[PDB]
Design a protein around this ligand. Structure first.
Ligand SMILES: Nc1ncnc2c1ncn2[C@@H]1O[C@H](COP(=O)(O)OP(=O)(O)O)[C@@H](O)[C@H]1O
Ligand SMILES: Nc1ncnc2c1ncn2[C@@H]1O[C@H](COP(=O)(O)OP(=O)(O)O)[C@@H](O)[C@H]1O
Lengths: 301, 283
């Protein structure tokens, strides 16, 4: 119950505009698209886009995950069982063992991969998805003709997503209700769609089909969903920088303080904060903007 | 490809022509070679050219594909005195497999080993010193990429204006693979408009739509330059730079600076690094 095409795909204007151009070209050229790479925080709709592309390209799609692959031959086998034009979608692609990753390079670039060698290749489209762009090797990303980084969603964009999704659940989510759920969804369709199913449940027990703002708030507060959508980690990060004065803190310190991986801070914890203008990456470390100070004060009132 | 109309790597080409001549002049195959440099600059291409010049077979493999002994022993046994063995990510080998390689390279069926690595400073002196020839591929000049792009464009049935090739060159971080990749994206913008001639206007539209940096910089390349520029040319050492960018030193010299040096954005001096005059002009 996710969008099936671009016809009414919400958000990612930039990615959509470009995919539309490359999709026209490939078809005009009577060929399949070059390899595509999607990167960005979980639940932003990259698995979705992958399947939309399969529909737009009237091509079949096969899915798998990096950890799911282990034996080098296994991958070689996967390639062997693909019809000319198909799409191969690998999620968490950044977790491929150098060995497997080494077998993939020639498959993408050339379409060919006792003693023995041989083995040609049908000619397909490899779509890779990662939530850890920083962990992706240059030899691998530089082989994707197309590279797209999903951005977070505006509250107005989530609103629409909720309104349409609500409809499929046989419910009318008023605008003001959509905006309030979005407000606590941390600009992420998955969280918002999750909260929607909870608000619905309150509507059901009250024999209601129209989710109002008032009832949305009832549900959200009753569940204790943070009013601003912050995680425990968002609060810890902002408190760490806000605790320090307008003096930048580098990963070395931050990572050390939050006893967390240095890469997890850049590609998982910070993306949302930077997106909503809570922090900035200065020339020598990070700093918290006015948003943070006023946001935190507001959260603890 | 075979050196005839080869673009770039002037010095490597110059030196290889001499060694290939001397080698053949004495009916022998080249000694072991080591190609060093960031990904996508042309190590594999050069290896193939050598295979053609020496008119010999070439077998490709990588360190991670050689797990434990049995793997390596099998590859060498299936060689043929004069053949060429190309091993990628060679600095990724274990001391055990690395130990089994030292002898074969020196003791031996005379063959030629070509090692490739993107981390020269990551490779050990003992192994490095056993490759008769050592070459550090260098980044390409705008004009060189432009010409390369124009040639690829022809194969893609399209004429690429000089200004259009340079623009792409500029944002392709002086790297053939990136350049080529961006060319195909621009080809698409051309197709949609029924254009056979890739113009600068169309190029910008594409590069900008995709959000490719104007100078092909990373988030790192910018902080690094902001760090050095702010220093008003008072030399800074690695230790300081390593801390400020929360980055490992080898990555700075081995992966980040190489490109910045090549395009004259920074300078290496006895007392440290400084932002060049060229970086004070552009923003
Ligand atoms: N742009 C979008 N428009 C509508 N729904 C979206 C959009 N992006 C994501 N979603 C929804 O959010 C959920 C998570 O999407 P998914 O593609 O699984 O994200 P990811 O692949 O990043 O984990 C899905 O139910 C999907 O329908
Ligand atoms: N000197 C060159 N002239 C034209 N194209 C080049 C040149 N060097 C590299 N390329 C192109 O860039 C890509 C990188 O080739 P490769 O040798 O695999 O780079 P590396 O092995 O260093 O990653 C290839 O598609 C190749 O066509």
């Amino acid at each position: 119950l996710r969008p099936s095409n671009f016809d009414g795909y919400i958000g990612q204007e930039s990615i959509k505009k470009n995919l539309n151009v490359f999709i026209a070209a490939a078809k005009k050229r009577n060929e399949c698209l070059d390899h595509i790479l999607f990167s960005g925080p979980a639940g932003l709709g990259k698995t979705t886009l992958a399947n939309i592309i399969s529909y737009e390209m009237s091509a079949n799609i096969k899915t798998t995950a990096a950890p799911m692959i282990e034996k080098s031959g296994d991958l070689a086998a996967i390639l062997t069982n693909l019809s000319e034009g198909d799409i191969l979608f690998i999620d968490e692609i950044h977790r491929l063992s150098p060995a497997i990753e080494e077998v993939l390079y020639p498959a993408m670039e050339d379409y060919r991969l006792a003693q023995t060698i041989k083995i040609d290749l049908p000619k397909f489209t490899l779509i890779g998805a990662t939530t850890r762009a920083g962990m992706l090797s240059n030899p691998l990303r530089d082989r994707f003709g197309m590279q797209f980084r999903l951005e977070f969603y505006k509250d107005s964009e989530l609103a629409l997503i909720l309104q349409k999704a609500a409809l499929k659940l046989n419910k009318t989510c008023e605008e003001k209700a959509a905006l309030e759920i979005a407000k606590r969804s941390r600009s992420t369709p998955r969280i918002a769609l999750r909260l929607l199913k909870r608000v619905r449940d309150f509507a059901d027990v009250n024999d209601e089909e129209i989710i109002t703002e008032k009832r949305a708030n009832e549900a959200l507060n009753s569940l204790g969903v943070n009013e601003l959508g912050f995680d425990a980690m968002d609060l810890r990060y902002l408190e760490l920088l806000t605790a320090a004065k307008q003096k930048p803190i580098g990963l070395a310190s931050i990572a050390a303080a939050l006893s967390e991986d240095e890469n997890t801070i850049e590609d998982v914890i910070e993306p949302y904060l930077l997106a909503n203008g809570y922090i900035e990456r200065t020339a020598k470390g990070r700093i918290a903007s006015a948003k943070s100070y006023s946001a935190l004060k507001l959260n603890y009132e």
